[PDB]
Structure to design on (1646 residues):
């Protein structure tokens, strides 16, 4: 019963089932303590992927995912991982080791100021300097990682602290509390402003993408019949019932129907809106608009964002109090016409161009065939790139937490490790991950962990042989691409070398059969599907806002 | 004519030959400027390895390696990379982008305090907030990265700053100056203590592992005939002439002849000694000895390290002034016997699979002296660090500061670019391999003549055997195997395999004569590893 | 003309700032120049520390952030302790400081440092604006964060070229920080349930319970349910004269109070806005399992001695009201009534001067009482740090919200007098009383010029013993000897007159009552030198009371 046991004791109380990590000499006492009791250790092939996996656990379970690494380069490898989780509202607790307290100021092996390093990228970055303080520090980490808004917590343990034998008792895993609903006066005022609105619309954001949030949002949308829009991490709010009120997903560029829908609005209700997904300077422009901020925390005042009302409190509760006293909105003919046109423009946008001819599959063809090959309840984790732009915009998701996208840091390589984390959260279910050919290699080494776990993952690789998202953004600004090209690899040979299944779409017509082959395959499968990116530049085309400008 | 050009203008003037990086929306303006002029861009497969490559360029060329990344996750991926370079005396300049100055406080895509993040892990972390300040900020970053002790410098560029058009002129790339040698009276006082010493020993350290230092160290060792020892990053100090005065490499555990040699000495002269490689509480113990600190910067006072003399100045110059007025030391009979027994003990220290010691030697005999050999981190690195002889400066590169996993392969890639047309050998573990194995694509793309050796045991053994000595059980050290040959072939590279311990020498030669990147899978018996921490030898 | 500096003033206008405390400088002068055309009144301070203190006092009294404006370099670095104090004591403060131009920000140039990096670990919000357009946003969010629970300090740094930069940027609406709804309904119901079933339920009113609107609601709860309650030092003023029979003093510093013994005997403790800085839970929540109910605007910090069984997070007054609405009077059993009776008795004996007392100087308890009797309930009393503060914090009764201000977070020396000046600006035309030690006096005594300049009606009481006594008696108790606590005397009367202020002196303990009335009736700043006998001070850390109660209870 030494300090390392205390760390494990906390993990038990927090109900931690899995720990992702990589052992080392400085953190060895805690890994040793985990052999006697505590959660199952998932050994990672890189601490970055260990942090990503934990993030996936966080977003899916609502409870902090736990990552355990050693001092020095082990700790510093969690940097990007935690930074992503901290900016994308995913509860993660990081446990890292450090050199002994007596040599903490010295130039010794793997020593640095851990707490100072993770300070600007976490909600909580502390280093325990007394063994008695372990149960407190770790508990407060779990609570703070979870408390709205969710984020990353980092706890550093000097080696002599985790090895120290102590008679210190454990501490109760007091659950993070939930707020009450927003102020009654604030809700009453909000209902009033929505009822008097000529065209009210709902902007569902990050924290609205929580399951219980989605549950309450849907009840509201059905009763009041408001047209709504999603941010990328709000994917899954849409139901097939609410398809007639759905106006797509806003993000990246102001050239979507939702942006035009938001423009026409006179009252906008934002739900759990972290502006990181889409800056308000992009959508809230052109005329005085009423903004009602509903969130678990106060609003960030921007030039383009100055809420006329703030409903701060538990997001689902606050929505419930609104939905109860709200009544159906009747739209005038003019507003109905606008909604009709936008829904028309929206449908026109989801279609492959008529003049299309190619040896490869169009991105929309890859999107459509994938959704029809994947059940609604199946979790799909997506990477970042041009492929991500298509997925975020056109891949429909009808259930909470089934389309995971990195819309905070837009970190390359998140797809596959999220999928591995997701499969452990939902055992016995197939999990689909989508990535680019460039972003793939960022975390492809974690495929060994997949085969080892026999995880039912289907990884789709959009093959263009370039960092295209940077490329077409270079062409639009400088009329030339720079440092976006790299060599190709045999993706099938790559998979097979890890002990996984590798398939390949040789022709655009084989797409449907290859996908279903993978969805029925056993174990991890990587799928190489070449794509034609000649239409990608139109993702930033302002043709659509122009057409609607003239029509108005 | 805009801020991005200024960054490149500095890179030109600094004589930067290569920039390793990955583009992004915020830093693309500088990537755009590199199309018209400036160094050749090497697109990496991960910013971690791009930073590693730059570290190798720094360690090999003496001028800072440059890495250029984007905002957000681009910047934060440099964390381990820069931290490694900063604690291992390798000059690196990192250039990262950031969000618009007007939105620097907002929750927007890829925003963080870049400068605040790299503060605890660099010698210099600044963020430029005015376009005029670019040539200054960049120039001083290079100077500080180079200045003793060398390390990592980080410069963050708001997107609007690199895109802003200005008529600001560039700034001259003033070279970091060299110090003069240590004080004359200080040099004389040191020489006095050495000639009167019964058993004087030289500890060549990190900053002694520099080329000009080694050249100057060797002249001192030949003339005075001093017994010396190496640290892991001091590999290459040994010459084939000086085999008779060499007493191995100290590190990791106190069970080496060197630890015992230093113990018996009464006066020890340390040269460019960073205590990060081996804490002085391990060797400077059993009895009072006089310590003379020779370095480019002052010493860190430790309980086991309190110098009686500090000769601070240019390392080679200070050494030359010693070598000039020093004379040969005659060793007494007792002391000569101690030196004799330990050199005997040294050789004394030197299955279905191949033994580690078999793999070290057979590689040395299969590899030319001038060929640079990069090593990763693990148990295999311990065998290499202790028994792989290097007879030329900068031919055995080891990460002895952070002990960072995955450094082997990208260092080799950086090296092939530094020494074009030369073969480069990299050694790594099977666990440490996948950390940066995706950078093999960059090697094949560059057609770099790299030879990678993978020690195959299927575990994180260095953690494993230290667990058995502490808790008598291993924890979280096991993982599955992969087909390394198929892996190589999938990248368009050559894959070989040692099926039997006798095939070792022939497979090695195949790779050394092969064209392009080659990976070699060699299985190892690690049942002997546990003796590395055995206290048998000191007893 | 519309320049960057104007945007800063425009924000202050929309925020409804009436006063700005500061000291001008070369880097921040553009904002000072802009304040000449429009904006709040500038209060020139004699040290930036006191400007931070005064701004803090305005925040604690008005609930809106007090504003402090300084220059680059040492001007900014002088705000360190001031802001650190406000940040740990729930007082809204916005600090606006200048810095060198963006082009020389990395250079060794005059008064350059990383302003933001310095104030990062001691404020809720420390940013530096690097674009003139971003000013109205940065500042507005600064005010909101400083006010948002838990209230604290925000620091905004302006490069000289940024505030001097001419820009056509529109201002941004001063959107008010919103209030939470009350705590969760099921959580409140569960709380009432655990309170009704309690043998001895007690309320611990803490820092955030000491706010006016909080106190209003707490009292209604206390009257209806008839719960015994206790105060922390910054919760002073919750007590009403109605509630005297349920009041059990103020816990703090040392565990030797009736309140500490009351909490020990309780089986259910309701904490209200309890920041543990004032008194760590390892001191009071000991010796047996107790049910803890954390009521606050933010979640709880889990300690070994503090692991709540229930958390009611939401607006503090609103949450209390829902409790008060559905709660009923608590009936105490015979055993519990006696425990309350004995403790209420022990409490009364503690507030009394010892019978064998004789001295040429005034006893601390005499100075407290005579001051309380010379001062109206509504008159704000600011207290400094030292042994005198212990007497005041424990024995000076306060019967209205925000009439006894104490620095109980950082325990910063010198806060008394500048707080009074800030108070004097908040309640113009009202007398303000400040209490300090002779050591803590000189830390900020130079602000006496600022009082005299404003002709503020302040009455400053200086406890004269000629030592750092609070350190001294704690040294004798730990080391059997004092170290570095002694210093020379100054003529406090002559000191006041030299600033143009009134100086009085209590030459004999009977003149005490008379001198105070003389001061309370004097015009302009008044300093009062009153000598004190500190021979009884060591009993403040005496463990006699817990010992007697230990024996009396084991009976
Ligand atoms: C760690 C990191 N580095 C750089 C970037 C910038 N970036 C955004 S998209 C992209 C390239 C994606 O390449 P790929 O995997 O091939 O997908 P594609 O764009 O081709 O669809 C890059 C480098 C990033 N978002 N994260
Ligand atoms: C980035 C990083 N993660 C973890 C460690 C801790 N560590 C030191 S050696 C080692 C395992 C080495 O495995 P391998 O590559 O197979 O070499 P081997 O032990 O088998 O010789 C680990 C995980 C480290 N030094 N750096
Ligand atoms: C800035 C600061 N310095 C030191 C202390 C420690 N301290 C607390 S009370 C005290 C001495 C108080 O002297 P005085 O004002 O004369 O009051 P007295 O103790 O005599 O009642 C000291 C030094 C502190 N709380 N803050
Ligand atoms: Mg691609
Ligand atoms: Mg291995
Ligand atoms: Mg005193």
């Amino acid at each position: 019963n030494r300090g390392a046991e205390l760390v494990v004791d906390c993990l038990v109380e927090q109900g931690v089932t899995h720990v992702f990590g990589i052992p080392g000499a400085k953190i060895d006492a805690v890994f040793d303590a985990l052999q006697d009791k505590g959660p199952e250790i998932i050994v990672a092939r890189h601490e970055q992927n260990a942090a990503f996996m934990a993030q996936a656990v966080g977003r899916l379970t609502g409870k902090p995912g736990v990552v355990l690494v050693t001092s020095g380069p082990g700790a510093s490898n969690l940097a990007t991982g935690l930074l992503t989780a901290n900016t994308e509202g995913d509860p993660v607790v990081a446990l890292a080791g450090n050199v002994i307290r007596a040599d903490r100021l010295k130039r010794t092996h793997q020593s640095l100021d851990n707490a100072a390093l993770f300070q600007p990228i976490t909600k909580y970055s502390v280093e325990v300097q007394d063994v008695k303080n372990i149960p407190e520090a770790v508990t407060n980490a779990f609570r703070i990682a979870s408390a709205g808004q969710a984020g990353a917590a980092f706890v550093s343990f000097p080696q002599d602290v985790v090895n120290e034998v102590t008679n210190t008792k454990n501490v109760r895993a007091v659950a993070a509390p939930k707020l009450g609903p927003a102020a009654d006066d604030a809700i009453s005022a909000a209902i009033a402003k929505i009822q008097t609105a000529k065209l009210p619309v709902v902007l569902v954001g990050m924290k609205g993408g929580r399951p219980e949030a989605i549950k309450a949002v849907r009840k509201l949308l059905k009763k009041v019949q408001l047209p709504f829009v999603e941010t990328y991490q709000a994917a899954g709010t849409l139901s097939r019932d609410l398809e007639d009120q759905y106006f797509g997903r806003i993000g990246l560029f102001r050239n979507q129907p939702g942006d035009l829908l938001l423009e026409q609005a006179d009252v906008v209700l934002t739900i759990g809106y972290d502006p990181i997904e889409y800056d308000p300077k992009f959508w809230n422009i052109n005329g005085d608009r009423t903004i009602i901020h509903l969130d678990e925390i106060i609003a960030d005042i921007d030039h383009a964002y100055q809420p006329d009302l703030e409903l701060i409190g538990d997001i689902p509760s606050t929505i419930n109090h609104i939905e109860h006293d709200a009544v159906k909105v009747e739209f005038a003919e003019r507003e109905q016409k606008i909604l009709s046109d936008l829904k028309q423009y929206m449908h026109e946008g989801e279609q492959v161009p008529a003049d299309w001819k190619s040896d490869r599959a169009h991105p929309l063809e890859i999107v459509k065939e994938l959704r029809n090959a994947v059940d609604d309840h199946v979790t799909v984790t997506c990477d970042i790139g041009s492929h991500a732009i298509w997925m975020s915009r056109y891949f429909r998701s009808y259930e909470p937490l089934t389309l995971m996208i990195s819309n905070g840091m837009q970190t390359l390589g998140v797809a596959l490790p999220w999928a591995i984390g997701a499969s452990l959260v939902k055992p016995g279910e197939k999990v689909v991950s989508v990535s680019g050919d460039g972003g793939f290699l960022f975390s492809a080494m974690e495929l060994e962990t997949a085969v080892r776990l026999k995880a039912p993952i289907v990884h789709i690789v959009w093959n263009d042989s370039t960092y295209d998202m940077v490329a077409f953004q270079q062409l639009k600004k400088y009329n030339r691409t720079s440092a976006v090209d790299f060599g190709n690899i045999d993706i099938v040979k790559y998979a097979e070398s890890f002990g996984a299944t590798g398939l390949r779409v040789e022709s655009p017509d084989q797409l449907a059969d290859v996908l279903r082959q993978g969805m029925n395959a056993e174990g991890p499968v990587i799928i190489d599907v070449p794509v034609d990116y000649s239409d990608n530049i139109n993702l930033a085309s302002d043709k659509l806002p122009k057409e609607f400008g003239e029509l108005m």
Q: What stands out?
A: The first helix of chain C runs from residue 4 to 14. The two ends of chain C are 81 Å apart (CA to CA).
